[PDB]
Design an enzyme around this catalytic site. Structure first.
Site: not given
Ligand SMILES: FC(F)(F)c1ccc(CNc2ccc(Cc3c[nH]c4ncc(Cl)cc34)cn2)cn1
Length: 308
Positions: A40-41, A43-46, A48, A68, A171, A175-176, A189
Site C-alpha cells: 500500500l505504501g 519508504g526507504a526502510f519501511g 505498509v 506496517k 506531520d 497525505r496522512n 501516519d
Molecule cells: F508512533 C507514531 F509513529 F507516532 C505513529 C502512531 C500512529 C500511527 C498510525 N499508524 C498508521 C499505520 C499505517 C498507515 C497506513 C495505512 C493504514 N491503513 C491503510 N489502509 C490503506 C492504505 Cl492505502 C494505507 C493505510 C497509517 N497510519 C503512525 N505513527
C-alpha cells in the site's frame, strides 16, 4: 539522520519515552495468520502491506488489514521507532477518526504492526483523482461541499482525541489522512512507510527532511512542537481539502525569503472551494501566536455545525 517516531506524548515540555511504555501481550497475533497482498505504501526502510488476518480480534474475524513493517535495510533505530510507534498506539486507545491498532507480531520474527485497512486510501490522492473524475464528462458519486466539511470535521475530531491524550502528531497532512468504508476520515501516519527521500513535499532543512510548508513558525525556527503547532498544520490540511489537493504555497520555492514571509505573517489565499467561514478558520489556525490558535475541539464543534 537517525529516524525518530513522529507522535509524541507530553507529561509535563517533558515528553515521555515511548521505549518505556509497556507492551501488552494482548495485542499479540500469530504472524502465520497473515496472508499478504499488494504493498500500500513503501519508504526507504519501511512499508505498509495489505493482508488478510484470520481470527483477528474478539469475534475471530477474517478481514483485510494494513500491516506496517521494516525492510532489511533497517537499523536498530528503525526497529525501535516501529516498537515505539506500537507502544504509543496501544497507550492512546481507539477512536473512530484515527487509524486504529488491531494487533502486533513481536515474537518469532520481525516486528509487524497490524492496523485498520482504509479502502479508499489517503485523502490527498482521493481528492485529486476525484477532481479528475468530475472534470471528465466535460473533457463514483461526485463530491459536494458537505463531503469536504465532513472530512474536515472528522479529521479535527481525530485530532481532538489525540490532544485529549496529550499526543502530538507532528506531520498533519492530507497525505496522512486515510479514507475508510463510508468515506470516514482517519488521521494516521505512514512514517517509515513513506518515501520522504524522494518526496518533494519534504524539504532538506539542515540534517532532516521536514514537511516545511505544513509547519508552524515556532517549529521551523525553534524546533518547538505542540498541540498548537499541529493546529497550524491542520490549517494547511484544511487548505488542501478545500482546494481539492493543490500543493501548499503553489509554485513557491522554499528558501530564505519563504521562511521570512511565513515568520512575517504571510498566508495563502482563500482556496477555490472554501466558504468564507472555513477560510477564517484557516486564518485562525495560522495565528503567529500559538495560544491564539483554536483548539481541535473548537474546530470540531464548528465544523460539525457547518456540515449541518
Ligand atoms: F508512533 C507514531 F509513529 F507516532 C505513529 C502512531 C500512529 C500511527 C498510525 N499508524 C498508521 C499505520 C499505517 C498507515 C497506513 C495505512 C493504514 N491503513 C491503510 N489502509 C490503506 C492504505 Cl492505502 C494505507 C493505510 C497509517 N497510519 C503512525 N505513527
Amino acid at each position: 539522520p537517525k529516524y525518530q517516531v513522529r507522535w509524541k506524548i507530553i507529561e509535563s515540555y517533558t515528553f515521555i519515552d515511548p521505549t518505556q511504555l509497556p507492551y501488552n501481550e494482548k495485542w499479540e497475533f500469530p504472524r502465520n495468520n497473515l496472508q499478504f497482498g499488494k504493498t500500500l505504501g513503501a519508504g526507504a526502510f519501511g512499508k505498509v502491506v495489505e493482508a488478510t488476518a484470520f481470527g483477528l480480534g474478539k469475534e475471530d474475524a477474517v478481514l483485510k488489514v494494513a500491516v506496517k513493517m521494516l525492510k532489511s535495510t533497517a537499523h536498530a533505530d528503525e526497529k525501535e521507532a516501529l516498537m515505539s510507534e506500537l507502544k504509543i498506539m496501544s497507550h492512546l486507545g481507539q477512536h473512530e477518526n484515527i487509524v486504529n491498532l488491531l494487533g502486533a507480531c513481536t515474537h518469532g520474527g520481525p516486528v509487524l504492526v497490524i492496523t485498520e485497512y482504509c479502502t479508499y486510501g489517503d485523502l490527498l490522492n482521493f481528492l485529486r483523482r476525484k477532481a479528475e473524475a468530475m472534470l471528465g464528462p466535460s473533457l463514483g458519486r461526485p463530491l459536494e461541499l458537505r463531503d469536504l466539511l465532513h472530512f474536515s470535521s472528522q479529521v479535527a475530531q481525530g485530532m481532538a482525541f489525540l490532544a485529549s491524550k496529550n499526543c502530538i502528531h507532528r506531520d498533519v497532512a492530507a497525505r496522512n489522512v486515510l479514507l475508510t468504508n463510508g468515506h470516514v476520515a482517519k488521521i494516521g501516519d505512514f512514517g517509515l512507510a513513506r518515501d520522504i527521500m524522494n518526496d518533494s513535499n519534504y524539504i532538506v532543512k539542515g540534517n532532516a527532511r521536514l514537511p516545511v510548508k505544513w509547519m508552524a513558525p515556532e517549529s521551523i525556527f525553534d524546533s518547538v512542537y505542540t498541540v498548537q503547532s499541529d493546529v497550524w498544520s491542520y490549517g494547511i490540511l484544511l487548505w488542501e481539502i478545500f482546494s481539492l489537493g493543490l500543493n501548499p504555497y503553489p509554485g513557491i520555492l522554499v528558501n530564505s525569503k519563504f521562511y521570512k514571509l511565513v515568520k512575517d505573517g504571510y498566508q495563502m489565499a482563500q482556496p477555490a472551494f472554501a466558504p468564507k467561514n472555513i477560510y477564517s478558520i484557516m486564518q485562525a489556525c495560522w495565528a503567529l501566536e500559538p495560544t491564539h490558535r483554536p483548539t481541535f475541539q473548537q474546530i470540531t464543534s464548528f465544523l460539525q455545525e457547518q456540515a449541518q
